Design a protein around this nucleic acid. Structure first.
Ligand SMILES: [Mg+2]
Ligand SMILES: [Mg+2]
Ligand SMILES: [Mg+2]
Ligand SMILES: [Mg+2]
Ligand SMILES: [Mg+2]
Ligand SMILES: [Mg+2]
Ligand SMILES: [Mg+2]
Ligand SMILES: [Mg+2]
Ligand SMILES: [Mg+2]
Ligand SMILES: [Mg+2]
Ligand SMILES: [Mg+2]
Ligand SMILES: [Mg+2]
Ligand SMILES: [Mg+2]
Ligand SMILES: [Mg+2]
Ligand SMILES: [Mg+2]
Ligand SMILES: [Mg+2]
Ligand SMILES: [Mg+2]
Ligand SMILES: [Mg+2]
Ligand SMILES: [Mg+2]
Ligand SMILES: [Mg+2]
Ligand SMILES: [Mg+2]
Ligand SMILES: [Mg+2]
Ligand SMILES: [Mg+2]
Ligand SMILES: [Mg+2]
Ligand SMILES: [Mg+2]
Ligand SMILES: [Mg+2]
Ligand SMILES: [Mg+2]
Ligand SMILES: [Mg+2]
Ligand SMILES: [Mg+2]
Ligand SMILES: [Mg+2]
Ligand SMILES: [Mg+2]
Ligand SMILES: [Mg+2]
Ligand SMILES: [Mg+2]
Ligand SMILES: [Mg+2]
Ligand SMILES: [Mg+2]
Ligand SMILES: [Mg+2]
Ligand SMILES: [Mg+2]
Ligand SMILES: [Mg+2]
Ligand SMILES: [Mg+2]
Ligand SMILES: [Mg+2]
Ligand SMILES: [Mg+2]
Ligand SMILES: [Mg+2]
Ligand SMILES: [Mg+2]
Ligand SMILES: [Mg+2]
Ligand SMILES: [Mg+2]
Ligand SMILES: [Mg+2]
Ligand SMILES: [Mg+2]
Ligand SMILES: [Mg+2]
Ligand SMILES: [Zn+2]
Lengths: 244, 50, 135, 86, 53
RNA sequence: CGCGACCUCAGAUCAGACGUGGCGACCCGCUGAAUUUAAGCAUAUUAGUCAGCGGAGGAGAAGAAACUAACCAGGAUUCCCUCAGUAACGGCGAGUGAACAGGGAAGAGCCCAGCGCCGAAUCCCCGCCCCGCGGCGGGGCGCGGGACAUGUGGCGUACGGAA
RNA sequence: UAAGGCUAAAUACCGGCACGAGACCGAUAGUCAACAAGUACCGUAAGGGAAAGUUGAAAAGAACUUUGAAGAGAGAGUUCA
RNA sequence: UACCCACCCGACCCGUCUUGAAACACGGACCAAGGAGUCUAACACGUGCGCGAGUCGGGGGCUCGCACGAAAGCCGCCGUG
RNA sequence: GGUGGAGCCGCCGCAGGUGCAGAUCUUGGUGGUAGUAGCAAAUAUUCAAACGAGAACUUUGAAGGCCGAAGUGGAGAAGGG
RNA sequence: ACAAAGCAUCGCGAAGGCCCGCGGCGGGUGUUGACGCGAUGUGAUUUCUGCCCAGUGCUCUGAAUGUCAAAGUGAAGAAAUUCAAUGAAGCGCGGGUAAACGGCGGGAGUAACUAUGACUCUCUUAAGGUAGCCAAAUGCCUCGUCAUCUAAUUAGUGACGCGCAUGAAUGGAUGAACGAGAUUCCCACUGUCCCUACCUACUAUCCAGCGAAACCACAGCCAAGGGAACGGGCUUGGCGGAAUCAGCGGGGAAAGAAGACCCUGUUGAGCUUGACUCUAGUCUGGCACGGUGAAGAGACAUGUUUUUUCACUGACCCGGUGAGG
RNA sequence: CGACUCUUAGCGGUGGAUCACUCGGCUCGUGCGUCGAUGAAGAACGCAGCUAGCUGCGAGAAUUAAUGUGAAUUGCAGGACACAUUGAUCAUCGACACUUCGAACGCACUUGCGGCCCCGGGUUCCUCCCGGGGCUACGCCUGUCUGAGCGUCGCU
């Protein structure tokens, strides 16, 4: 009868993302002469960290090669980047940690992060806190390249798009146990209102389809059609297997 | 409130002058039906229209 | 077409009015253009419209409008009937070429409803007990 | 404690005086009136409580212009003329 | 509930008649509004068949 | 590499106008239920109704046949009597449900486009004078503008019309 | 003879201005409202929403004396009452 | 006959639903004013009256500013129906 | 008979919003209950004078007391006007 | 009880997952990118997590000779039409999956007291309950049997286990710390009790002052009888003495509320699903916007149709920037 | 005859029924058929010699001029007026006037900020500053001006 939590995360307005103190988008410096033909320069200012993200950001100062000014960016810092390092960008850049190149240039097996899935979108893939994406193999004509993502899936990408070299800094954030309910509330209090999650079996059948009963049992198979209406589509969504 | 707007202060200015009683010679005019004001207010009971 | 705006399927009531998806609009798409054209320019007076070109997603009608208070219309007769205040917003009451066809009037055995003035004043005359003074 | 105890922490106000209505109806958070509907250009009358309709319609105010329009018409709507002098 | 040999009587009052009832107390005053027009038109076109063409 | 037409399209506190809102009994577009009835109910019914929304006028809408008819034929629309609670509709049930003819109130008819003819024969706004000015107009005079040939004015529109 | 257009008259009016009438109601009736009524008052608000007519013909509405702190009295007077 | 009192005999509290109410069934402290089978349409039968194989009645029309009139009277309209 | 101060009924016909004990009826009024329940949360008052028609309750003086600076003290916000 | 850390599955590489919205080229997650987001289940740690894919689900580059509509094509007719061929998704078929929903049985003989039965026979199913645990908050019979604790125990603790009807993330077994959580026993303590007593304050009490309400047919002493089958009134007895004060809780089936139980009603609502009838949403086909060029192929025919595949870029779409090479 | 209680009556309270009135409604007719950016409907705040409310009005504010009318107004004052006078008062209303909101209109709703023009003081435009007046909303028409375009060209 009611509208189940999960249906409500869409309207927002409470279930909305918590973003006052966030330092700004973690982007990748869109393209020009410098990226498409040369090797524009720039130095690292600081490694300030943003709330709600395990990776530290880096304010990298280039200088705009068209008007006397100083463009400043926010790169997801590759592990090893320090303050004062020179980060070089573009096609003619050389292969070492923190230099953004086009994946077409660097050899196979290179370990990159903050990759783009379409050319120019300023960095989308493999940028979480400790993830990387290994370049697999090239294809000179058709200008495509095969890339392995942290999920283990392999994706064919156009050789143009760029990606910084190295791994994302802050690896192993999942290794230390949260260890107390305080540290969880205190952790999501920087991301959005998705915390203490009530299991459906504890709600009355008007609020969640797994409800009701004189015992706290589910009642119907917890695997559910992918072609489900919103509101039923709860539990194991379109599970192919189910079990360890 | 002691931190009043101007529109709010005017409103109290008008409600504070409607409060007085009826002049006693009114009770002398020819066709009267009025004895007592009957439209008076007292700040403890019937708070303002606010 | 039209889509019945209820905040889900959500048309409470008997399963006859249960419908949301497939229903159509009473007026035409041309009499929607003339409306939006004369709704913008409240000074001007809609006269008539025709078709120009169409898409899978669009239909481009194009509308002739007239300025009721320009002396090249006020002085020349046969066009000063648009100045008279009777004709304010002809297309809002369904008085243009396209708008009138939705009202479904005409002569003959086809147009029997709307045999008074219009489709409303038709049955206003049928659902009235004519209780005479003398019975 | 839902009464006589919660009826105590009631300091701040939702509504105030509307600049068009004159009624204590203006919603401060929502910034719309709610008896006429203020920032909306049209008045919120309704065919749907006729008793509220007849509380403020033509004639219930002063009609301080309309009341002399009925006067002029009755006589002929003339203007720019003065009765014959003495 | 029928009783013992009447008619079947489908009377049309199910809809809402009380609202749209048209009483005819104008009837004798309309006889007079028309009568003046009938006369005022004949006096307006004086030599002419009052009945019309 | 400039200048000039036109076509599109901008900006003006440019010259002059005009639109919004209110009322809402009657009126015109659209939207549109459920109580209720059926002794349950889902079709039906309530009902194209209440509410919602838009728009007017002193009345509105309608209106000069892509009609009615089958007759020895009638002749725009609207209203009243009538047709008739009838032809038809309908879990053919509850219930719904018109028209034509006839009598009467009233009675009025007309324009375009096009096809053509006519030297654009046209219209608008400026500037000077003559009259008129408390519903801004007429008369004249101006190489004062502009619209119009991608189409203005006169005859003409099917009852026939032009020549 | 469609795909374009104009049009008075009979026709409708629980709003408005201005009237006229009644086998109507007569102050718990008749409009919520015969009166400072959509007023007093309630509700944050949408909204809700009352009670309450009559001295006499003329105020001629009781001067004065007296008891009482005073309210109230006793006489007196006004009045057809 | 009606006021008070006395006596002898009789005598349970009304309204209601109910097979059955004084009921350990329910409504009812008391008193004032208000308060419930209405109008319309459609049939049906009975009854009264006019005319009678006919008979109307409506809408119209002809006669008023109504005082009484938004009445009454009249019309191959009276039969279009 | 009385008080009351301006209109009213008989008969023949016509028309109704036409007859009240009752509906946990509506509105207004008034009882019995009853001069009853009650005027019992935070220890506390007393003497003299003043004023006054009138003092357990005002005011001044004196005495006893409590709040005891996380106040029953000194200032503000919102709210009140 | 919930939450919780922890453990665990599940979807998803962005024209994506989940999700909102009436509608947009609309919005949330997303100032995000698998160490992220969304969807669930269990609930620290320790120790473990057993069998079952037959059922219902979910899912699977899975065969779709099963069926199957709109159009589409084919044929007869004069035409409405009628009859053909074909065939998308889902349905049918086949794989996987139980940390998905959930499931995990019944009989006889047989050992040297008796009994019991290692052992051996059938039967059935998808496996037939494994490790553990138990008269537990889960045991009908039930104050199960033994012991212990008591003078005495349906209580408690401990063992026993054919357990009406325990048991493995519908989690099993444990368990330090913690608990206004549930029980049992002992020491200390006590007016809880034997068995009550007195003392204090505020009341009540009386007075001056001021003054309500619920309730009320009429009312108010009993026995028995009858009676709508328990009277205050009626019948017969008993009896009856004004006006009241403090108490009191036997009676007025006392007041408070048109019974919350129950039953009826062709009266409803909340929730559910294998009820009936539908719907938003989503999957699939057709048609439209929808073009250009290229090869090539089958079917029919002796051009048509089906078109398969690979290109193109002008619609269309997404990406970036202060539209700078 | 003690008090209380009950019934009835005489009077007295309490209460407002009945009755009689009625500047009000309801109903039915008739004539008319009258809003607003020259700023409406509605709202706020003001305005009387003594005035709170209703009503009437708008800083010219219980009205203004004008025209009829022709001696009041009144609760008390107080008054002008010469009642041989627009002449007191009322009615009409056609001259003039119209605080702040409001479609509300420079931007905003605090009542705050501005801009652009003018005219006073200030200045001797010296910019403020102070005072005063006129503009400055959106949409759209016709025209006008200034433009933009590797749009179509033409001349070069
Ligand atoms: Mg629960
Ligand atoms: Mg559910
Ligand atoms: Mg208070
Ligand atoms: Mg005629
Ligand atoms: Mg309008
Ligand atoms: Mg029914
Ligand atoms: Mg029924
Ligand atoms: Mg029903
Ligand atoms: Mg239905
Ligand atoms: Mg219908
Ligand atoms: Mg409506
Ligand atoms: Mg018209
Ligand atoms: Mg027309
Ligand atoms: Mg006809
Ligand atoms: Mg018949
Ligand atoms: Mg119907
Ligand atoms: Mg021509
Ligand atoms: Mg036509
Ligand atoms: Mg009264
Ligand atoms: Mg009375
Ligand atoms: Mg009344
Ligand atoms: Mg009286
Ligand atoms: Mg009286
Ligand atoms: Mg007397
Ligand atoms: Mg019984
Ligand atoms: Mg009994
Ligand atoms: Mg009962
Ligand atoms: Mg009298
Ligand atoms: Mg009567
Ligand atoms: Mg009575
Ligand atoms: Mg203390
Ligand atoms: Mg102080
Ligand atoms: Mg699970
Ligand atoms: Mg398991
Ligand atoms: Mg399976
Ligand atoms: Mg076992
Ligand atoms: Mg244990
Ligand atoms: Mg014990
Ligand atoms: Mg045990
Ligand atoms: Mg007592
Ligand atoms: Mg009892
Ligand atoms: Mg039954
Ligand atoms: Mg139901
Ligand atoms: Mg089913
Ligand atoms: Mg007495
Ligand atoms: Mg008396
Ligand atoms: Mg009264
Ligand atoms: Mg150009
Ligand atoms: Zn308002």
């Amino acid at each position: 009868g009611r509208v189940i939590r999960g249906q409500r995360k869409g309207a927002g307005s409470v279930f909305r993302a918590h973003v006052k103190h966030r330092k700004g988008a973690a982007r990748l410096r869109a393209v020009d002469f410098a990226e498409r033909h040369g090797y524009i320069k720039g130095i690292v200012k600081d490694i300030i960290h943003d709330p709600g993200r395990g990776a530290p950001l880096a304010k990298v100062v280039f200088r705009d090669p068209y008007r006397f000014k100083k463009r400043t960016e926010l790169f997801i810092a590759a592990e090893g980047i320090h303050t004062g390092q020179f980060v070089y960008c573009g096609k003619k850049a050389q292969l070492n940690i923190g230099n953004v190149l086009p994946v077409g240039t660097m050899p196979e097996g290179t370990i990159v992060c903050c990759l783009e899935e379409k050319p120019g979108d300023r960095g989308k893939l493999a940028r979480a806190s400790g993830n990387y994406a290994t370049v697999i193999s090239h294809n000179p004509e058709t200008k495509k390249t095969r890339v392995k993502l942290p999920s283990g899936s392999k994706k064919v990408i156009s050789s143009a798009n760029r990606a910084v070299v190295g791994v994302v800094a802050g690896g192993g954030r999942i290794d230390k146990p949260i260890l107390k309910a305080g540290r969880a509330y205190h952790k999501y209090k920087a991301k959005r209102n998705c915390w203490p999650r009530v299991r459906g079996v504890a709600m009355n059948p008007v609020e969640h389809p797994f409800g009701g009963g004189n015992h706290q049992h589910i009642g119907k198979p917890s695997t559910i059609r992918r072609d489900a209406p919103a509101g039923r589509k709860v539990g194991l969504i379109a599970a192919r297997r189910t079990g360890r | 409130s002691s931190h009043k707007t101007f529109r709010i202060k005017r409103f109290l200015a008008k409600k504070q002058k409607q409060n007085r009683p009826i002049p006693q010679w009114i009770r002398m005019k020819t066709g009267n039906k009025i004895r007592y004001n009957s439209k008076r207010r007292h700040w403890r009971r019937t708070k303002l229209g606010l | 077409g039209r889509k019945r705006p209820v905040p889900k399927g959500a048309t409470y009531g008997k399963p006859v009015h249960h419908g949301v998806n497939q229903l159509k609009f009473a007026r035409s798409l041309q009499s929607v253009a003339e409306e939006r054209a004369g709704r913008h320019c409240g000074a001007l007076r809609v006269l008539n419209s025709y078709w120009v070109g169409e898409d899978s997603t669009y239909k481009f009608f194009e509308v002739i409008l007239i300025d009721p208070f320009h002396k090249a219309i006020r002085r020349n007769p046969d066009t000063q009937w648009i100045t008279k205040p009777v004709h304010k917003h002809r297309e809002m009451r369904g008085l243009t070429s396209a708008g009138r066809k939705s009202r479904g009037l005409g002569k003959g055995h086809k147009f029997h409803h709307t045999i008074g003035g219009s489709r409303r004043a038709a049955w206003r005359r049928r659902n009235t007990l004519q209780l005479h003074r003398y019975r | 404690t839902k009464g006589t105890s919660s009826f105590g922490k009631r300091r701040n106000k939702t509504h105030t005086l509307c600049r068009r209505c004159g009624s204590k109806a203006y919603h401060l958070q929502k910034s719309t009136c709610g008896k006429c509907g203020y920032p909306a250009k049209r008045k919120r009358k309704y065919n749907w409580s006729a008793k509220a309709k007849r509380r403020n319609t033509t004639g219930t105010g002063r009609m301080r212009h309309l009341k002399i329009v009925y006067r002029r018409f009755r006589h002929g709507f003339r203007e720019g003329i003065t009765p014959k002098p003495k | 509930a029928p009783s013992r040999n009447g008619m079947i009587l489908k009377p049309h009052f199910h809809k809402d008649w009380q609202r749209r009832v048209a009483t005819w107390f104008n009837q004798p005053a309309r006889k007079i509004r028309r009568r003046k027009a009938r006369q005022a038109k004949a006096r307006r076109i004086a030599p002419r068949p009052a009945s019309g063409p």
